[PDB]
Design a protein around this ligand. Structure first.
Ligand code: 6NE
Ligand code: 6NE
Ligand code: PLP
Ligand code: PLP
Lengths: 810, 810
């Protein structure tokens, strides 16, 4: 139907049709008379998977022969979403599969909606790892993603009586056709035990053993016939485990719980033993695999020439002392040489400066679970602090600040400090964030070793986040500038020569309108809600958090409502305000914010005086598959975190690529997006980082803003008095108390500038032609935010390997 | 190579070769350069499985159209063993697969040894269900086996220092290619809760829900293109189960433990809550499936015309009150009509008279777990006892004896009494056993309802237990009488015309010798043990139990040893005595017997004076796959249970079919085997049932036998004094104390007659021609013991359906 979806040749369609029928019969054991849509989905997935196999085997054989430097991306999270459409896109099979299923009497889009998201992450950090895997394959890098195969991913969110309820995400119930179990490559992982010191070194003995069984998932590059691997470990008890008899077998669950569930906290550290077990499990199993592959390529001097390990935050930080343990205790390298190898192999990416998100593990947990690792960490610390002392003699406070061991009531290990000491490179994820690291939390480290610190601004894959989710936009672009931009997104700059082209303006606007109609329909059918498709679609989708300031959005919505009620017969630009995101189950304030948003909806959406001028919708169960629907439909992207708190953001980039304008603070990558597009084509408001620092030095007093801004006082009085909760008038007192007396994120300080900036948005939306011209200027300068650009920078500046667009033969 | 293995046509071999390679590539994601024997096994299994699919779909569609009466065989145990060879045999693919793999450079026998046994049973009762499924398919019955898919089957037995150790049987680790998950047909099962009485009947409310997810396994008939289904249920937690957050997800294991492990007790009842949950789980899920299929065929009067439910012992006895519950509480049938339907639908097979094996559930467990069921059972009991009272007025002790409720310290429900009340037919499993039921434990029931009581003597499938395990024997038979006997085993009677044929005598003896050499080699390679292949192979393989009297065998072995030591230079017929079997993990005496057998081996096998005249081997990890190796190699089959204790036995029948002579008591089916072959062709010894009864009336005094039999006194003194345990002299005191003071099974009473009968065996073995002529007379009269004969009798006399040998079209 559309060009970018590839060719539908007769021979190819014929072959797909017969393989579909073959799988339905032999694989699924069904005939057409009793087959359901689910069976049809599975038959199509198996048919598409068959096309990955030859490329997968040949890619991995190619790495074996050529022996390139291998890149290992370690993460506790991979937020993959659905795989079927992505696979078709990357192998150029979408139009052929569409035609094949059409001829069989099936709608392929209907079949696509049956697939479960692979939800093995919380949000941005997990989704970054997934875009990175897509880019590494597209750039021909010999790359492996290593993680945990959680039985249960991020919970499914239900809203009941306006409140979040959680349900287990049993994503594997119907089977996962994309993974291949590899029980033959199962490896042992050790826990507990004790250290014995002998004549020939330390020995870690009396341990409990858990097995790590790998499942491999293919990761296709974009039309280059490269298929890399994501290897996810599953925990298994050994067969003699605990071996009355029945209890012993049932107690195998204690070992197997390690891979049962994803911790569901975004940007929040919870120091639980089970989480520490998960972190060591992935690290221990992965490093054995790395070393095996390296020996099957004595001379560990070449290890850093053949291996790069990238740590996605500190969560796999135990890779550093585990590598030292293997090299020292098992391979019998001297300490200094092992440390040299480790440092040159490891690199660390930091994704946050929020104190509560930083990993600081109690010494007593490490002492019990990983006694040899604690010893190694102590030794790392002593050697590091001897370097600090030599560089900064007499500076005793620096020694305390830089230590990997934090003193106090309970001693803890600072994992970020460990990562910096043991990595040859440390990066932040946007320019402003990387600057903050050098000026604030990692200042002392930067002074000691300035050469270690880098920036790598984040990106997103334009396969999933344009071609897959917005084929209509992708097509009208390819009509003008060809298809090369899909793997070289900087080519979107050529669209600037169309900003005055009347045909292009019309088409860009038509595609948004079509996306908005489709989304409005999806709402009605799947959630029985009726939105005005001519209204401005104002969207804030992301995890619920105080720092992301969904609360500031709420204050604006209430302001708009109150202004309408004051002057009902005055014209205002109609808005549909959509907010979605999951709250961590234990995060009380985030749960209260969800309830506030639905309560505002309950009042606003049923007030006859408002009509269809203002609607507020809470989008339930926000996840990767829902992002693919709502992002192409958005007009306005809300990116309104307190300056200094969002390390980068990536949702921001997805909206930019899909034809929404951004209202935002100068935070994370928003700064670079405004720089690329031009500040005139961005709706920037609020305190900069320097202004936040100034307020903090003076002392933030929320009462001042309440006292001076009548519209803000009205809202707080409505909240406190029970206007949005008539049957429970004190329901939102926690929210009010926080706003007035202990708001770390300064919601009131940005309120006036936010409201005024939102008026400017509404004014521009009244002029469709000029709205759309600004959109074209955003889409055209979105090229920098391709994760292909990001990964090429890691490759050249950290990993020491050259990217390639050259195709392997099929 | 051999005719009974079918044809190897070029087209067929060509197609198998290309499907093997296809599966290795696309299914396994391997190439030949890194593929291991395991991968090659899996590629062959998938190739063979593809041939089942069309036949499976067409068989089930045929039942849907024709709507025959359906037979549901409910069991907690299905001891299936390996599936690959059986499937090839039944589809006539063995020679073609042999040729195909030969041409690919592989040995198919090597590939066969990689497959795990499906060990979902303890021994005879579970293996009976498996032979029955094979016969039902071969006879064209519309039959379904329903059970539990245990994650862990019967434990793997290791012998360490002469003692049994248990290891979990993680049979699913590498995947099971023979099953198909059917998550779409998942059904809810209820537990706990309470009963509410309303205007319109009882309601069972406030229950906990566990889901039952079915996995289907095909069951091919022998060369008739029929493929029936074995449906096994797996327990799953609902997604809102227990829904801090992490604990709630981890606690899902509480629900899922129901299907985790097989209780490993043979002929012993253990009244544990988890076992009761397993029994209700299989019953509740199965009956919903039965009723669904019946409605998709209001009028439950036709239910018994369209459904037969066979209860494999009392373990699925809750089917009776569950069916009443559904009919009364849910379908709103009046009690009397529901009871009529239930009785006509259900039939019960009893497999034991041992008191400790009989299920008697505490009322307090049922009251908590299954409150509505207890109420229904009370009501069944009251109505039944009103019938007894009308039939036998004033006989108050009969009312107490017949009650389903047993009074005492703790009240219990007698499940056998429940089954008799609620079944239109009750059978034992061999003629002597069925007679004992009517004379002893079920006498009162037989007096009330004589028409209910039947016999169905057990059998074994001659596909697995001749053609598969002993192709050499199968071939030399088919040369003389053709191939029809494989599905009509009574045709073996034609072999009586060859008992004087010198060529046949030679061939029968050659095949045994070849089987013995092969087994002797298997021992050496897999267990480094060196046995004399010219010796008499004297074999007792079966679960370890006091009633089976492995101890009596031990006394004979020690007698033979002592007699050799007394007269070293006298000639005796060389013997290899092999004993194998698993002990239940909590059965202390059975564990002590294993240790005794290995301790006797330690002394005997290293005494230079004995040489290779006597060897004693304990065969580790006895299971279906090992039975298939050792049974064709045996000369003498030991079937020596105390008369009245082995309900039937089935190992006995396997040995008879495979050319061993039997030494045995007149117990279970041994009686009928002697009757078929002629008493002159059987080595019968010992007390009959009547003699055991006489001794019990007088009082069994073991001391009498000790006092009168010097050879027996010598053995006991050796045991007591530490002759077989020099470093722990009192090691076997428990065994001695039991033998002397509390032997329920009268080991000493049968000792003299056993030893004398064993002398007659040795005398006949010295004459190879006459040995072999007696063997031919056994093989020739083994026809009655085909499970095809058994199932035809159930079909005609219990289920009301006619068997068929007519082939469905392929
Ligand atoms: O670089 C990708 C994204 O990483 C997010 C991110 N940083 C830290 C986390 C995090 C995620 C999961 C945890 C789990 C346990 C403990 C701490 C944890 C921290 N997540 C940032 O908020 C985005 O601005 C950024 O765009
Ligand atoms: O009919 C097949 C075989 O059934 C065996 C058998 N009877 C009862 C059992 C049993 C098996 C498993 C349990 C588990 C729990 C409670 C009781 C349990 C009872 N097993 C008999 O011993 C054989 O003589 C007979 O050949
Ligand atoms: C991109 C994405 C995120 C990150 O969004 P931010 O606005 O950068 O926090 C979170 N969740 C999902 C499902 C995403 O696709
Ligand atoms: C046949 C069989 C049994 C039953 O043997 P008996 O001698 O009748 O107790 C037990 N276990 C296995 C593995 C079998 O094949």
């Amino acid at each position: 139907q559309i060009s970018v979806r590839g060719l539908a040749g007769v021979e190819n369609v014929t072959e797909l049709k017969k393989n579909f029928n073959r799988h339905l019969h032999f694989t699924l054991v069904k005939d057409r008379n009793v087959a359901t849509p689910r069976d049809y989905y599975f038959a199509l997935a198996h048919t598409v998977r068959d096309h990955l196999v030859g490329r997968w085997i040949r890619t991995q054989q190619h790495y074996y022969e050529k022996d390139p430097k291998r890149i290992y991306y370690l993460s506790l999270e991979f937020y993959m979403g659905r795989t079927l459409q992505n696979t078709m896109v990357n192998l150029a099979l979408e139009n052929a599969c569409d035609e094949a299923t059409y001829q069989l009497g099936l709608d392929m889009e209907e079949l696509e909606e049956i697939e479960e998201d692979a939800g093995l992450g919380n949000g941005g950090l997990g989704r970054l790892a997934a875009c990175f895997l897509d880019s590494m394959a597209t750039l021909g890098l010999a790359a492996y993603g290593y993680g945990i195969r959680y039985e249960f991913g991020i919970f499914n969110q239900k809203i009941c009586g306006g409140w979040q309820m959680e349900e287990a995400d049993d994503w594997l119930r119907y089977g996962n056709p994309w993974e291949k179990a590899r029980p033959e490559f199962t490896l042992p992982v050790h826990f507990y035990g004790r250290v014995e010191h002998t004549s020939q070194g330390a020995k870690w003995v009396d341990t409990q053993v858990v097995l790590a069984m790998p499942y491999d998932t293919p990761v296709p590059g974009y039309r280059n016939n490269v298929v890399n691997t994501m290897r996810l470990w599953s925990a298994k008890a050994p067969n003699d485990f605990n071996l009355g008899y029945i209890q012993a077998v049932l107690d195998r669950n204690l070992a197997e719980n390690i891979s049962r569930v994803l911790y569901p906290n975004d940007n929040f550290f919870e120091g639980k033993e089970l989480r520490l077990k998960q972190e060591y499990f992935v690290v221990a199993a992965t490093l054995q695999d790395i070393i095996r592959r390296f020996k099957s390529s004595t001379n560990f001097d070449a290890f850093p020439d053949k291996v790069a390990i990238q740590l996605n935050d500190t969560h796999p930080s135990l890779a550093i002392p585990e590598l030292m343990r293997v090299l020292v205790d098992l391979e019998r390298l001297d300490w200094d040489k092992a440390w040299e190898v480790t440092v040159k192999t490891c690199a660390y990416t930091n994704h946050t400066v929020l104190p509560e998100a930083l990993e600081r593990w109690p010494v007593h947990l490490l002492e019990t679970l990983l006694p040899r690792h604690l010893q190694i960490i102590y030794e790392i610390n002593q050697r590091f602090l001897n370097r600090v002392a030599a560089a900064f003699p007499g500076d005793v406070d620096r020694l305390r600040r830089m230590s990997l061991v934090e003193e106090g009531a309970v001693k803890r290990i600072n994992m970020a400090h460990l990562c910096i000491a043991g990595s040859h490179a440390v990066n932040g994820v946007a320019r402003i964030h990387s600057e903050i690291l050098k000026k604030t939390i990692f200042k002392d480290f930067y002074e000691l070793e300035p050469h270690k610190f880098q920036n790598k601004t984040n990106g997103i894959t334009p396969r999933r986040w344009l071609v897959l989710c917005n084929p209509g936009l992708a097509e009208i672009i390819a009509e003008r500038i060809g298809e090369e931009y899909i793997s070289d997104l900087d080519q979107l700059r050529k669209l600037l020569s169309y900003v005055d082209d009347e045909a292009f303006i019309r088409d860009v606007a038509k595609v948004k309108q079509e996306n908005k109609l489709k989304f409005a329909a999806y709402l009605e059918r799947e959630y029985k809600v009726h939105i005005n498709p001519n209204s401005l679609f104002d969207v804030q989708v992301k995890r619920i958090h105080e720092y992301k300031r969904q609360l500031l959005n709420c204050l604006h919505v209430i302001t708009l409502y109150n202004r309408i009620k004051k002057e009902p017969n005055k014209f205002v630009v109609p808005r549909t305000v959509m907010i979605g995101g999951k709250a961590a189950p234990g995060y009380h304030m985030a749960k209260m914010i969800i309830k506030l948003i639905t309560a505002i909806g309950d009042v606003v959406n049923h007030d006859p005086v408002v009509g269809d001028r203002l609607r507020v919708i809470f989008l339930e169960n926000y996840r990767v598959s829902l992002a693919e629907k709502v992002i192409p439909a958005a007009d306005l992207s809300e990116q309104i975190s307190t300056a200094g708190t969002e390390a980068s953001g990536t949702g921001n980039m997805k909206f930019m690529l899909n034809g929404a304008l951004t209202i935002g603070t100068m935070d994370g990558a928003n700064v670079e997006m405004a720089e690329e597009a031009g500040e005139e084509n961005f709706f920037i408001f609020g305190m900069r980082v320097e202004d936040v620092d100034r307020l903090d030095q003076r002392g933030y007093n929320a009462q001042e803003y309440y006292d001076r801004i009548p519209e803000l006082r009205q809202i707080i009085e409505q909240l406190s008095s029970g206007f949005f909760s008539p049957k429970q008038p004190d329901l939102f007192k926690d929210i009010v108390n926080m706003l007035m007396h202990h708001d770390r994120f300064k919601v009131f300080a940005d309120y006036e500038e936010y409201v005024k900036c939102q008026e400017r948005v509404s004014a521009l939306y009244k002029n469709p032609r000029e709205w759309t011209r600004m959109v074209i200027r955003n889409i055209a300068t979105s090229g920098k935010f391709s994760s292909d650009r990001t990964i090429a920078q890691y490759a050249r500046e950290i990993w020491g390997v050259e990217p390639s667009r050259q195709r392997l033969p099929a």
